[PDB]
Assembly symmetry: C3
Homo-oligomer: 608 residues x 3
């Protein structure tokens, strides 16, 4: 008769289970809890870095340009037999009396050179106090004053060597720069001075390093400087230093050391700096600069910092300013400011805050912020902050992803527990399909009260199943079968079995499934890889799944992967671009300069 | 009789609910929608940075080495009483006529020094034009030419001071470098020249800065240079400059200023630069360099840029080249190129594109790209691009994570809405278990049509429950109980209640649960923390959950957390390694050099 | 009679479906698998960078300070007519014999200058061997020795020019520095020396670059140096070099070249460096420094590296040390160390490891690590490692997110497949509501065996529905209706239809829904946007959803988005701060220094 038109499936005989095998459903699981969560402290921060910048100040130089030339005369020319140039230090006396008082300078220089007291005379005449005319126009320089525009040369005497002295008294304002430990400094002209710029008398600054004779240094109390250009006196009374070097004299207003230098520099003021304790370490996170710093749980004492006067003062001046701008009505200062040393060598000044609304915790926390209180050297700061920003970025994504998937993991678990209650009611309705989906294999099931009995199924080949043409019971008219009759064999050569088709291609051995006849009885029955269609209890034809419209119970979820991505090296200016930005390269110049003999002369030839 | 073998659970009496308390299920919720999503513009980009590189050019120096020595003679030695060295500037005349025309130089130097016209004679003889032999072998230098290899010294005259003049005419090619604002420059020898390298006559370049006398400068139109080595003339006619300084004369081919300098440098050409509007700002993202830039919605006018000629020209030359390589058949140029200033001080040249397939929007968008059109100073570029790459990385992960969890949130909601339809049918089947799971507490339920009536349950201690030995009804044989009989008391000292065991350890008060007897009736019934097993309506024994095979209805989901991770500071070369890479340190050298008197002499002793 | 109190809903007439339209549920889907996952190799790494640091060594200088002064006398002063200073190279002879043997130096200098053999006499007397007293106190300098503290000046002779010679024999220890390609070097004093620091005799180091005469260089085998301060000889016998320049003589112990220089520097030792193959490239990831490097699958041969002796030696010395500390009992070395060149110009030395527990794969993998084995130039290393840390951070988050959502996608799919089994049983119970939720529209459904027949519903306006007051059947007492009677019309002007209220506001056309009467029959029935309440089969009143307590079947899931975040540019020290940290700026100084004539004199005036 009729075999299956679709052979791409299996049939199963499903005998009733005895109770030899019994199973139960797993009870609901204890669901994970959301973590308590990191507690953040609100605070104002000031981050500090290593000071790499030198101390800078204003200074004035006083010297003279002593030039002695030697000229020869012939027919009819002249030729310098030599030009001797030297720098003569202007003694304290002339500066205060001739310059700063009148604006004039001497036409004579007198100084110590190579262990002899030499004396020069401008124009080889005698003393004459000469006004200090401003220096010629030159951009990006300080002001300057000279007394003579010209070099003096001897009158012509044929076939003779004559000498001419020139004296130009020079006063220029210069910048001075000193580096740690501030025991010597340099001028804009390139001259070194081997003394601390804080060497004076007032207070204990006479302890500073000097390498010159005591008589080279003098300090004037109440020194009223007079602008050599506007001829104006100074309304302010400044203390003024004067050191006389072998080549010059340097004047500058003296100032105390500590309130003027610092081995630390204020870097970032942070309005909202959240501190969380995490792992026996502190995390100072700033949303505004995307930076997270890591420190120990103990403060760093500023008494361990060499020359760190500016730290306390700068940290307070900012915090007060910020507190008054942002928190002057919303929070409360909890304790004095704190200082922690962060990885990378950053010093963090921190002022814990507490919300007005939660003021009931002040004491509880005030005690805590006092636990961290501190019971000389130099801090070294890295040049790259990128690690602390990697930290910040990573922590933030990490915290978010873990939070969210954590929530999903819980919601997933709750839903599994809840749906068990549906599975429990479903299993009574259709023990076979439920048990099969639960276990993972087509089995036969039957409730034994509260547990579920399970027996295995037996496969039957598709070509071994024949469906009978009719569904009407001839013996007792007025009654028919609900589902079609079938015949089959387990093995290919075996005998036929009288059976009835059940759901899911199950072959039932009892033909008991009986219903009273009806009109227009049209049914589709699952049969093989498709359906068999009956019309009024008579076989019509078979058909395929594709012939019937499909609708889904499934809820779509469209997850795609985040693709691989390659980060290439990328620099704004490469290390070489930075080197080449310098206008002159000392090394390059010296290398050429010192090749000059080799390139253009002969250092390996003696004449006799 | 028989108590519970497992006392680790609860029993509940569940009286029928009246209707005093009624509940309903929450209707389906409005599910969230997926956001519309950022629209990206396809475009070609050229990113620009601050130009930190100086202008560089070729120059030739012309000077002479005037050396006058003084020697003394004894028995039987010689000793230099002095050596006077000077650099004599070669006048325009000799360069064009003797050098560039023949290759020879004069044996005499004549120049201005200390306000006197001096004159030198090589070998103290008279004029003699001397060929310019190439300079000696020296690596990594330019070429050079000198006329004399030797210094001339006077013939021996016992007990006498004699003088000897030496003249070496020198011509070397040198590199020149100038920095913004290009009003002076330096040579490779270290010499400064206080004039703009664009100072000439042609066009309006006579306006450039100079600080020398007019007669120091001359320019030759059509200057045919002659290679002093190969003796070859220049086939090309160049305009040539000549400035005469107090120490030398510098020659170099003159060129216009604007098409030769720029305060900006092309940094990255970007094939695909996506621009999205987001937050009243633009985002220029480049997948290729992993960089996202942030700019305002308005272009930056190039008319605000000082010396930015190269920007327009370079930006176009690249975009055209790229368009022709990649988009010459796929897209359409939309408007002229645009320029936006990005955070960090990056100038972005941008050319919007439009896909051929979507050409119907040209006008619609062409109008938009014209809205941004612009209706002198210096741009400052940071050295660190890392922020814009942090930006890029973060945005990309952010966009992906939000997209995906967004989808989950929707799919989760849809599934909750869908399953309600199962809960609705389940509640009819087992109002007690469904109501209990829904509320959260063991209650008793009953449908009142479309709402659900709920009463509370009553707990009964485990030790207060006894299960009867039989399940057979003695009064009417041929009928038995479905579930075992029980007896219990609410309070420990109270009286016994005739009852029947229901599902989930419920104690039913009516013993109505009756079924017709059967053969082989074996049932497991939930009882306490385990099951009670009956066989043919007679008590067999109790047992524990562990005694029965467990199968799960639950679908596993294995979510683990992304662990904490610490980013340490890491530098390739530390700030100090970069300092020390320099071969000579000017500061270190000067500090030693200027200590020399102090270390090896006496600057504090006068002899008389 | 009674209309709906809540008009905010719809009613539907749901006629039985014929079988004209039939649907089926979508079968379970094939669920995605978890990917196999990247396999990591455990290994020890040593990362190498470009060596930017010069070669540094100790050197001694030997020269003399020859000073000849000229003084004039008057009434009653003195004035230097000139001071000639020169540096005289100390010949090999005096250093070994007078200095290194006794500690004394000559009072005479004899040397070659400007092609003449000059000779100087200290104090203008004759030879006298003078002890070398230590140099004066000066911080941060090396030691030094001079013979004379004073400059000698001639005795006073009125109206006469007299000359005085001074000789100071000087010996100072200096540091020397040379850069690639190491063919010349510099001293701390700033002097250049144009010879390779490896120029000697022993081995083939006579091939090094020199630019001086052969007689300028001498090497002493077995040179026992004597400390000029402690008067102590050297117990060690060193080979010693002596080069004599025109200005000085430099001595230094000679050493071989290759084992002393390198164009590469060890940067990071990495304990655990995981290597994975991914995309025809290798990924070397280090958890400890948060860095992921990218290389080709082929080793880089060290034979392609110029002067890379240190690489092999340093890479082994560390790996052995580390292996012995960490893996001396846990893993096995697999092959000789390997070298790969990574993007950014990093050289990675790698030693693959294998866990003892998985030793069965040695051969299988030993063969593989030999496939990569290599069958001169300079490597260039970027200054920024940030890209490889971006890489690391991104990959790690990427891997985690994809893993987890991947798992969710699978678990989601499995749950959809599992719940179908519930939907299958539910549809028999309530074909109307199930079919409606499945399709998406209120339809009418009926099972046709195994498929489901579906017809559309018809909407009826709310104001068109009237609910009858009673529920009792007058004709046959002892029986009532389960759900209320209703009357309605499809169109507003149409006729009334006798009908019964079903679930979900369906209007049933057959009034068959009949139950036997009961006492206390109180029911709530869905009616419009609320319920209608009956009490003992008689209409009571209507009410709203809000009047009844709501309980939810829904499981909450609380997903929030990860917000936008802006990364601002942030630098620790800006490019300008780094420039200004230098104490002296060569360029700044030279610019001032060379302005001095222009500012303070006149270079444009001839006197006659
Ligand atoms: C505390 O913070 C608030 C923040 O707005 C300040 O409010 C402003 O205060 C200034 C001057 O104090 C007023 O001119 C402004 O009009 C205020 N802003 C408004 C009204 O929006 C407040 O002043 C701060 N308190 C102190 C003492 O500085
Ligand atoms: C926080 O305190 C710890 C103390 O455990 C410091 O650890 C030091 O780490 C360095 C580097 O490895 C070691 O050389 C020291 O010996 C450690 N100190 C001690 C006491 O063991 C750590 O440096 C502190 N953090 C900061 C930022 O200073
Ligand atoms: C536009 O882009 C396409 C991209 O492939 C170019 O195609 C190549 O064109 C060159 C020369 O124009 C041919 O030699 C190649 O064989 C082409 N590549 C192939 C066939 O794969 C195209 O030429 C471009 N158009 C212009 C005008 O440059
Ligand atoms: C985009 O336009 C805004 C205008 O709101 C610019 O904002 C400036 O921000 C700086 C730094 O805080 C302020 O000093 C200026 O006063 C602001 N300008 C104005 C007009 O308020 C912003 O700089 C622009 N973006 C770029 C990259 O230039
Ligand atoms: C191999 O590694 C283990 C790691 O602990 C080493 O164990 C330590 O070894 C040292 C000296 O070898 C002992 O002083 C320590 O007490 C050991 N640590 C303990 C016991 O915790 C082991 O020694 C290593 N092997 C070699 C040969 O170095
Ligand atoms: C890995 O091998 C590839 C070979 O395909 C190298 O690719 C080179 O890439 C540069 C830059 O684009 C090109 O200039 C070369 O022409 C390419 N080489 C070849 C043979 O095509 C790549 O450089 C290698 N990786 C490393 C780190 O060296
Ligand atoms: C899911 O999205 C991917 C790409 O985003 C698309 O290819 C696929 O067709 C989508 N499928 C569904 C069912 O949304
Ligand atoms: C889930 O994964 C974790 C680690 O990935 C493992 O410990 C656990 O046994 C796994 N459980 C299941 C049910 O997959
Ligand atoms: C979910 O969380 C958000 C914020 O985290 C909160 O506003 C909302 O009330 C929460 N809702 C539930 C049902 O958890
Ligand atoms: Cl953080
Ligand atoms: Cl982006
Ligand atoms: Cl990785």
């Amino acid at each position: 008769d009729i075999k299956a038109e679709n052979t791409d499936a299996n049939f199963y005989v499903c005998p009733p289970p005895t109770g030899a095998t019994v199973v139960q459903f797993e009870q609901p699981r204890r669901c994970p809890t959301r973590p308590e969560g990191q507690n953040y402290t609100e605070g104002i921060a000031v981050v500090f870095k290593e000071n790499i910048a030198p101390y800078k100040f204003k200074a004035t130089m006083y010297y003279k340009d002593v030039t002695v030339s030697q000229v020869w005369f012939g027919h009819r020319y002249s030729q310098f037999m030599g030009i001797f140039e030297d720098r003569a230090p202007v003694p304290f006396e002339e500066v205060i009396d001739k310059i700063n008082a009148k604006g004039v300078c001497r036409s004579t220089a007198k100084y110590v050179r190579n262990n002899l007291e030499t004396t020069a005379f401008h124009r080889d005449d005698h003393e004459t106090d000469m006004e200090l005319k401003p220096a010629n126009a030159a951009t990006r320089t300080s002001r300057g004053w000279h007394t003579t525009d010209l070099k003096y040369n001897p009158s012509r005497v044929e076939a003779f060597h004559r000498y001419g002295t020139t004296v130009n008294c020079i006063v220029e304002e210069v910048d001075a720069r000193s580096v740690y430990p501030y025991d010597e400094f340099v001028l804009a002209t390139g001259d070194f001075v081997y003394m601390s710029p804080f060497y004076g008398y007032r207070e204990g600054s006479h302890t500073e390093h000097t390498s010159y004779a005591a008589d080279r240094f003098k300090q004037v109390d109440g020194f009223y400087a007079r602008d050599l250009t506007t001829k104006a006196r100074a309304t302010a009374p400044t203390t003024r230093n004067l050191l006389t070097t072998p080549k010059f004299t340097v004047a500058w207003d003296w100032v105390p050391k500590r309130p003027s230098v610092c081995t630390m520099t204020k870097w970032q003021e942070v309005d909202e700096m959240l501190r969380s304790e995490y792992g026996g370490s502190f995390r100072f996170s700033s949303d505004a600069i995307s930076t997270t710093f890591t420190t120990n749980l103990t403060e760093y004492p500023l008494s361990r910092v060499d020359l760190g006067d500016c730290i306390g003062k700068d940290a307070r001046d900012a915090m007060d300013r910020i507190f008054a701008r942002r928190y002057n009505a919303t929070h409360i200062k909890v304790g004095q400011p704190q200082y922690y040393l962060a990885n990378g060598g950053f010093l963090i000044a921190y002022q814990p805050l507490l919300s007005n609304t939660l003021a009931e915790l002040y004491v509880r926390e005030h005690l805590r912020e006092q636990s961290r209180k501190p019971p000389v050297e130099r801090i070294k700061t890295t040049s790259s902050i990128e690690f602390a920003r990697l930290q910040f970025t990573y922590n933030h994504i990490q915290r978010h992803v873990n939070d969210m998937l954590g929530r999903v993991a819980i919601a997933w678990c709750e839903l599994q527990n809840h749906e068990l209650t549906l599975w429990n009611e479903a299993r009574k309705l259709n023990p076979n399909t439920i048990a099969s989906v639960t276990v993972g294999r087509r089995v036969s099931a039957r409730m034994l009260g509260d547990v579920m009995a399970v027996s295995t199924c037996v496969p039957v080949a598709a070509d071994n199943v024949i469906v009978q043409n009719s569904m009407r019971i001839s013996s007792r008219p007025g009654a028919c079968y609900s589902r079609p009759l079938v015949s089959f064999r387990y093995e290919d050569q075996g005998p036929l079995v009288e059976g009835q088709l059940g759901e899911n291609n199950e072959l039932r051995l009892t033909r008991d499934a009986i219903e009273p006849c009806t009109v227009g009885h049209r049914r589709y029955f699952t049969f093989g890889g498709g359906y068999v269609y009956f019309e009024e209890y008579a076989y019509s034809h078979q058909l395929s799944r594709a012939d019937i419209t499909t609708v889904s119970t499934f809820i779509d979820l469209n997850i795609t992967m985040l693709e691989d991505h390659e980060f290439v090296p990328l620099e704004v200016y490469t290390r070489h671009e930075i080197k080449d930005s310098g206008l002159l390269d000392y090394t390059e110049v010296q290398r050429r300069n010192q090749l000059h003999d080799l390139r253009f002369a002969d250092i390996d030839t003696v004449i006799h």
